[PDB]
Amino acid sequence: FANITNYYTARSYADRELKKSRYSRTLSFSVPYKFIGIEPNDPIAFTYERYGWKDKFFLVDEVENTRDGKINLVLQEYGEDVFINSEQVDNSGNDIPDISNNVLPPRDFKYTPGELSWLPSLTNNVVYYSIAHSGHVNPYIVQQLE
Amino acid sequence: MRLPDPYTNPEYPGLGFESVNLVDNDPMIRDELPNGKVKEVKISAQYWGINISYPELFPDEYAFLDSRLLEYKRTGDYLDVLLPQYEAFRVRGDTKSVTIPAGQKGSQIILNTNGTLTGQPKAGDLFKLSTHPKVYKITNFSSSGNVWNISLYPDLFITTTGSEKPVFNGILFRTKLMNGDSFGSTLNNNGTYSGISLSLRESL
Structure with missing residues (x-):
């Protein structure tokens, strides 16, 4: 889904499109000019007697308006099950934030009467810490030799 | 132009029609439903088709008929036919x-x-x-x-x-030749031009 960002609505949409794929039947026939106005996504109920088909929900897939007057329809089979939709499970704890794109600071820090308390950063990409005082123009350098 | 008739000029007999056929040409689209109904729509027009057949023609009558038909062809005017x-x-x-x-x-x-x-x-x-x-x-x-x-x-x-x-x-009937494309007349041994039939359609 290129356009859907909800996990849940995309979940329901995937369920709907799966069931639509599950039905998968096409009719193709022509109707007289009485039925003018039929539009390529309109509901009709086809009732051929031999098939056993009493009212059967189809959405048209093609309409071919003709100069003569006849219309060349093509059908697709969509039962109510695709639109009835289903229930979904909670998905909130399974979030994946992008924590892994920045270097982390010292874990702890306090001054004990020097400033040593900084625990090494969890990022193993670390070379030298920097300490900046209020008046000292040149910042200190502590290096991760080990 | 008034295609020649015995009323127009009777000194050439045999230019009278020996068989006039009004073909009620009505182009029309019909569909036959399985329901039993017949559905039919009128478009285009309806041209009265006149199917004229001529007897054997002596040289004078056929010469006159060629004169008139060539006057019809080189000019843009329509043939006129009177049905008696x-x-x-x-x-x-x-x-x-x-x-x-x-x-x-x-x-x-x-x-x-x-x-x-x-x-x-x-x-x-x-x-x-x-x-x-x-x-x-x-x-x-x-x-x-x-x-x-x-x-x-x-x-x-x-x-x-x-x-x-x-x-x-x-x-x-304002009409035009539909046989103008291949209009021939065989001159037999007898000297009579034969097999000259005219098919006419209205040009309203």
Whole structure:
């Protein structure tokens, strides 16, 4: 889904499109000019007697308006099950934030009467810490030799 | 141009038609439903097709017929054909004083005659409007003394402008050769030009 960002609505949409794929039947026939106005996504109920088909929900897939007057329809089979939709499970704890794109600071820090308390950063990409005082123009350098 | 007829000039006999065929050419789209119904729609037009066949022609009559037909071809004018079987010469009188309402349309012309037309036409006599070339056949008739309704089989190719007048007599089918492409006539041993038949269609 290129356009859907909800996990849940995309979940329901995937369920709907799966069931639509599950039905998968096409009719193709022509109707007289009485039925003018039929539009390529309109509901009709086809009732051929031999098939056993009493009212059967189809959405048209093609309409071919003709100069003569006849219309060349093509059908697709969509039962109510695709639109009835289903229930979904909670998905909130399974979030994946992008924590892994920045270097982390010292874990702890306090001054004990020097400033040593900084625990090494969890990022193993670390070379030298920097300490900046209020008046000292040149910042200190502590290096991760080990 | 008035294709030559015995009425036009009787010194050439045999130029009279020996078989006239009004082909009621009505192009029309029909569909046959399984329901049992027949559904049919009218588009295009309806050209009276006249199928003329000629007897053997002596050189003089065929020379005259070639003269007239070549006059028809080199010029752009239409052939005019008079069918004698419909030359009933009913109605009679003049047609200048009769008036037709403003816009009539719809295959029924209701024209009122004051005192100038004396005679009721019979259903099946050709009827023409003065301005428009094509000729209509009447299918029914009803009169109220001065105003009589006339029903036409072709559905009034022209609309009504308000100055239209009937003809009822001496009408001519504006027609064009449909055999102009291959128009030949064999001159036999006997010296009579034979097998010259004309197929005509209206050019309204």
